[PDB]
Amino acid sequence: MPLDPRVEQFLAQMPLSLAEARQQFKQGALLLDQMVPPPPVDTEDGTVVTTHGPVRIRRYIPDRLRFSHPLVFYHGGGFVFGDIDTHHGLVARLCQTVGATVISVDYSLAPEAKFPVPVAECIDVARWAAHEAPGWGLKPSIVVAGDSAGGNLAAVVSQRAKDESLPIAAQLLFYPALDMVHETPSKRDFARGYLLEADAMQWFGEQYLRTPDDVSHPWASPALSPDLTGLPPALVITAEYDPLRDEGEAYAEALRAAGVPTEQIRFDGMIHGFMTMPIFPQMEAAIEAVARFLERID
Numbered sequence: 001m002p003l004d005p006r007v008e009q010f011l012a013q014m015p016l017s018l019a020e021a022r023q024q025f026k027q028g029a030l031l032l033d034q035m036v037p038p039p040p041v042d043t044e045d046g047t048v049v050t051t052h053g054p055v056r057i058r059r060y061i062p063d064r065l066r067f068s069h070p071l072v073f074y075h076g077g078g079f080v081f082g083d084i085d086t087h088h089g090l091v092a093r094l095c096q097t098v099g100a101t102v103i104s105v106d107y108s109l110a111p112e113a114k115f116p117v118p119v120a121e122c123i124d125v126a127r128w129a130a131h132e133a134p135g136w137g138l139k140p141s142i143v144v145a146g147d148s149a150g151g152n153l154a155a156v157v158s159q160r161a162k163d164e165s166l167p168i169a170a171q172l173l174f175y176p177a178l179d180m181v182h183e184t185p186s187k188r189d190f191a192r193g194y195l196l197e198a199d200a201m202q203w204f205g206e207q208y209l210r211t212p213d214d215v216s217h218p219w220a221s222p223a224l225s226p227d228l229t230g231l232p233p234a235l236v237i238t239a240e241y242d243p244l245r246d247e248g249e250a251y252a253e254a255l256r257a258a259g260v261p262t263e264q265i266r267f268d269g270m271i272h273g274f275m276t277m278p279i280f281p282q283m284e285a286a287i288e289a290v291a292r293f294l295e296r297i298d
């Protein structure tokens, strides 16, 4: 299907120390939010005590509460970039459109923290949210969610949830990274020129992983896990022109065949990252998909 016209324009108009690279990523996110301002939303900043230290969070409170579980959201950025501010545009809209309380998580970034530290942190935050939920008037079971590297974390938390005695009602994976071992067709076909590139992915792995062997660890590559039975209901959103497309869709098929209630949606014409790029109407369409999916959980 042709590249979406606005996407095509965005790519055509695209033109460092670690600190500078992080600031650049932050500046781009700011520019997009200036172009398409987020909805106003009540928020509260907090800090959760994890097994690897304090992790800042931001709780988003909907104008009108309509969903009975808290959402715990883990931002993307290759494990190296991003924060609660870079993903505010997405989270504010998830909050208000779903009518859900959302916990956005500022997990520890690489290379300063290495695999599997943020996985541990993300579990600890999920556990905290489950314990708080009754006092917010909610069910203790949580929904985990994330984009890209954040979708990785969400998928891994979900695979660990039973073992960690963590009640999870659903998982929302937005163009996740799931298999660091295998090349897929999309990974070859869209390797360069679609925002998320091959070289960047390599560099992200070099920052996050301890050694090259970690690629086969199931907490890095959750698509490798042989037993997906009994995992939480899954919404897997992919972009057509994304190197990570094929691994995301393959995992959705594997979940489905393992009896996990699964919705798999490819947004045609789109690229990696589109759900934090509000210049594209498909971002809000995908958020509507989330709301529709979550309507069916209870």
Ligand SMILES: COC(=O)c1ccccc1C(=O)OC
Pocket (backbone or CB within 6 Å): 217
């Ligand atoms: C070396 O750290 C890890 O990879 C790890 C961490 C906790 C539990 C298990 C493991 C493991 O699989 O290898 C020891």
